[PDB]
Design a protein around this ligand. Structure first.
Ligand SMILES: CC(C)c1nc(CN(C)C(=O)N[C@H](C(=O)N[C@@H](Cc2ccccc2)C[C@H](O)[C@H](Cc2ccccc2)NC(=O)OCc2cncs2)C(C)C)cs1
Length: 330
């Protein structure tokens, strides 16, 4: 089997991407944020505290003839930005782009933090990291991909995120028409539960490539590219007037600037992030100070290849016995 679904930016900055997911019988379609940096499939639901729901579409398990309470199971997750959610669990039929998993754990939120409430476009998360990070207790649950894998034509999924445009998530096959050149594969460590890999270096603009190992995670659920402070300083030093603002919480630059590209290495191959991808717009409405899309990871404790990086590539998440990651230009 295979599945193929379009993923759509939630706003004009590509802050996140949402993908329609069918849950239950008859189907309830929710728009989920596919996240290769976490491993819980959780949704806004009929159980979510009413004051914490503001415009999202909800899952109502009582309206699904295939929903079954997963008795005694609870979940609770805390994310890198301080956001969180928690609740109870149902198993139900879940389909993505024509690929169906029966018996998928659907984590129903009873509570969500303010950042989720305030985003009416995201109806929940679909985690695509390793199932060892799933938070359901006392019986840990598998991700949608892990449950589907043995049925897929190939044990893979791909992320092809668009710049100011929709993209695609494919399950079980590699669309050889979706990229240029060849795919370069690189080793993954699963020891922390993430798609954790090592970039071989970077370049800023037309500058020389610096060979240096940069460990980090391929993370579709984070908007920006978070790298060591050394790398980030070398980038922004090429932009007149850019500076790190403690008040704003990172690097800002004059909205009048034209930004240089940023290249990262994948083995001997190179992925080029165009300058325009690094512009996240005014820090507040009407400001002439713009927010940078490359920021320091210091204090996060991990480097994060978020959407700014991934959307410059066709990315293969290879869930073979020894997982690997592939990157191609497109
Ligand atoms: C316009 C508005 C709606 C939006 N702003 C954003 C930008 N934001 C907030 C982020 O990128 N926030 C990032 C974040 O926490 N992302 C998260 C939550 C999230 C989900 C959906 C939408 C938005 C956020 C999702 C990410 O995959 C992070 C990556 C990570 C991993 C380890 C350590 C630190 C970080 N995953 C986790 O935090 O997983 C932690 C886990 C805990 N237990 C099991 S896994 C930070 C790391 C920067 C997106 S949409």
């Amino acid at each position: 089997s295979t599945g193929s679904a379009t993923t759509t930016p939630i706003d004009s900055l590509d802050d996140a991407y949402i993908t329609p997911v069918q849950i239950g019988t008859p189907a309830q379609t929710l728009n989920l944020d596919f996240d290769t940096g976490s491993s819980d499939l959780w949704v806004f639901s009929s159980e979510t505290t009413a004051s914490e729901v503001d415009g999202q579409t909800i899952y109502t398990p009582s309206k699904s003839t295939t929903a079954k309470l997963l008795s005694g199971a609870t979940w609770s997750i805390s994310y890198g930005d301080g956001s969180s959610s928690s609740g109870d669990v149902y198993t139900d039929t879940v389909s993505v782009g024509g690929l169906t998993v029966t018996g998928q754990a659907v984590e129903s939120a009873k509570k969500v933090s303010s950042s989720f409430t305030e985003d009416s476009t995201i109806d929940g998360l679909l985690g695509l990291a390793f199932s060892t990070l799933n938070t359901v207790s006392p019986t840990q649950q598998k991700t949608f991909f892990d449950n589907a894998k043995a049925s897929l034509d190939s044990p893979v999924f791909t992320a092809d995120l668009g710049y100011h445009a929709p993209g695609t998530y494919n399950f079980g096959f590699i669309d050889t028409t979706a990229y240029t050149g060849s795919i370069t594969y690189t080793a993954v460590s699963t020891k922390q539960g993430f798609w954790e890999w090592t970039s071989t270096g970077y370049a800023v603009g037309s500058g020389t490539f610096k060979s240096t190992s940069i460990d980090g995670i391929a993370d579709t659920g984070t908007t920006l590219l978070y790298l060591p402070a050394t790398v980030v300083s070398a980038y922004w030093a090429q932009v007149s007037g850019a500076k790190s603002s403690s008040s704003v919480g990172g690097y800002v630059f004059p909205c009048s600037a034209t930004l240089p590209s940023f290249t990262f290495g994948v083995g001997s191959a190179r992925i080029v992030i165009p300058g325009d991808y690094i512009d996240f717009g005014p820090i507040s409405t009407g400001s002439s100070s713009c927010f940078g899309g490359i920021q320091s990871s210091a204090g996060i404790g991990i480097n994060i290849f978020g959407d700014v990086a991934l959307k410059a590539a066709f990315v293969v998440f290879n869930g073979a016995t020894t997982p690997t990651l592939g990157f191609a230009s497109k």
